[PDB]
Amino acid sequence: ATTLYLTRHGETKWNVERRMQGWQDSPLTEKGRQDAMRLGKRLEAVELAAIYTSTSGRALETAEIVRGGRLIPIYQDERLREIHLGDWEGKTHDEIRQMDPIAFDHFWQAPHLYAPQRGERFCDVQQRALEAVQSIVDRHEGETVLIVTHGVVLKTLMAAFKDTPLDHLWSPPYMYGTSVTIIEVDGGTFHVAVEGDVSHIEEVKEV
Numbered sequence: 523a524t525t526l527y528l529t530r531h532g533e534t535k536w537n538v539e540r541r542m543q544g545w546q547d548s549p550l551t552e553k554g555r556q557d558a559m560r561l562g563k564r565l566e567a568v569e570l571a572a573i574y575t576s577t578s579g580r581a582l583e584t585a586e587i588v589r590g591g592r593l594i595p596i597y598q599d600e601r602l603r604e605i606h607l608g609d610w611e612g613k614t615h616d617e618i619r620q621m622d623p624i625a626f627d628h629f630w631q632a633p634h635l636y637a638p639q640r641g642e643r644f645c646d647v648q649q650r651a652l653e654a655v656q657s658i659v660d661r662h663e664g665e666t667v668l669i670v671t672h673g674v675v676l677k678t679l680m681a682a683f684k685d686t687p688l689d690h691l692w693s694p695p696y697m698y699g700t701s702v703t704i705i706e707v708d709g710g711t712f713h714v715a716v717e718g719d720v721s722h723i724e725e726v727k728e729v
Contacts, residue, residue: 524659525666526705527565530673531580532558532587533699537729541614544607544641547579553725554580557700558587560722564702570594571665574658576602576672584700585670601654604672608641634689644688648678655679659707673697683712698726 532554536543550558565588575585577598585596610618610626618626628635633644651671658667676697681688683705695718697703704716720726 523664524662524707526655526659526707527568527570527666527668528676528679528703528705529561529584529588529668529670530676530697530699530701531578531584531670533727533729534580536612537699539614540729541612542607542610542618543578543580544604544611545578546611550580550583553727554584554699555587557723558584559590560724561700561702562588562590564722565668569666570668571662572597573668573670574599574602574654575670576600576604576675578603578672581670581672585668588668588670599654599657601650602669602671602675605644605647605674606642608638610641630692632689633691634687644674644678644691647675648682648688651675651679652682676703680714680717683714696728698723699729 532550534543534548534550534554536548538551573585573589573594573596575581575596575598577600581602582596582598589596609621613621625636625638636643655669658669677691680703681691686693697718698720700723702716702719706713706715
């Protein structure tokens with residue numbers, strides 16, 4: 523019996539510039555910080571035993587803002603990092619479309635067909651993210667925790683929880699920055715209670 527709150531890091535500069543981050547990082551924007559602040563207020567009444575975040579600066583910064591001085595430990599786990607995008611990190615969609623048009627089309631349109639020479643495939647991410655989630659559950663029996671991670675990671679996790687094949691990874695809803703997803707883990711099963719809720723967000727951006 524464990525309650526898991528899942529969210530995505532707040533908006534960063536590269537998100538706005540449509541530049542893929544992956545393992546590379548960029549600072550949160552004013553809006554990103556404001557959204558994280560709004561999420562922190564929404565969870566001020568939730569009894570969080572701990573907060574897990576990927577090692578990316580954007581994720582850690584979001585976690586700190588949400589914590590906002592509360593006595594809650596933050597643990598970082600490499601298994602929660604965003605998909606490693608090798609050659610595409612730091613580049614805009616147009617720049618990538620000029621580099622590898624076919625692979626880029628697969629990434630968005632036929633996830634199961636995405637097979638980079640350098641970088642992780644969607645299944646690699648799903649496996650490590652689920653392992654991390656499992657380890658978190660195993661360490662927090664009877665507790666509630668927050669996990670701050672990334673867009674692709676969240677999509678692969680929801681696919682696992684909803685028992686959806688990876689070729690349909692990009693099915694709605696869109697996981698906006700600081701969106702709230704709640705997973706109830708009871709009797710060895712993951713139950714999706716809430717998914718991609720953005721009630722606390724003023725202006726929602728598909729970034």
